[PDB]
Design a protein around this ligand. Sequence first.
Ligand SMILES: Nc1ncnc2c1ncn2[C@@H]1O[C@H](COP(=O)(O)O)[C@@H](O)[C@H]1O
Length: 124
Amino acid sequence: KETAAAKFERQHMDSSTSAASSSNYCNQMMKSRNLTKDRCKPVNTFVHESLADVQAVCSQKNVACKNGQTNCYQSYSTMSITDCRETGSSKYPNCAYKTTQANKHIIVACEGNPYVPVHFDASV
Ligand SMILES: Nc1ncnc2c1ncn2[C@@H]1O[C@H](COP(=O)(O)O)[C@@H](O)[C@H]1O
């Protein structure tokens, strides 16, 4: 089965690009990462940093999660990320997104042994 850890990597990791590939990036990536499979996933963030760097966030600044759990962590450094947001004109199965690149601190929830990212909570 797909572990939660693998699912985080599929949904949120993109170390290959340093930053968003112009205007087409979200359209292609949301599809290729299977987030347009059974609906247009409305909102999603990709992180353009090494896996090791993202994993290391599980030992950085402990902050409250949006759902009220205590297992969330904020990166001490800013990271290169891309926010994808579904357009008003987007209609399944033709899912359309705005690609917005930025540099922000990420917030991830971590679980397990090893203690790794399983949920992307926020960027700040
Ligand atoms: N603190 C957390 N630790 C682990 N997974 C979480 C956490 N917060 C949210 N999730 C995951 O993200 C989804 C969205 O959370 P919610 O909006 O509370 O339904 C949940 O179904 C979980 O799959």
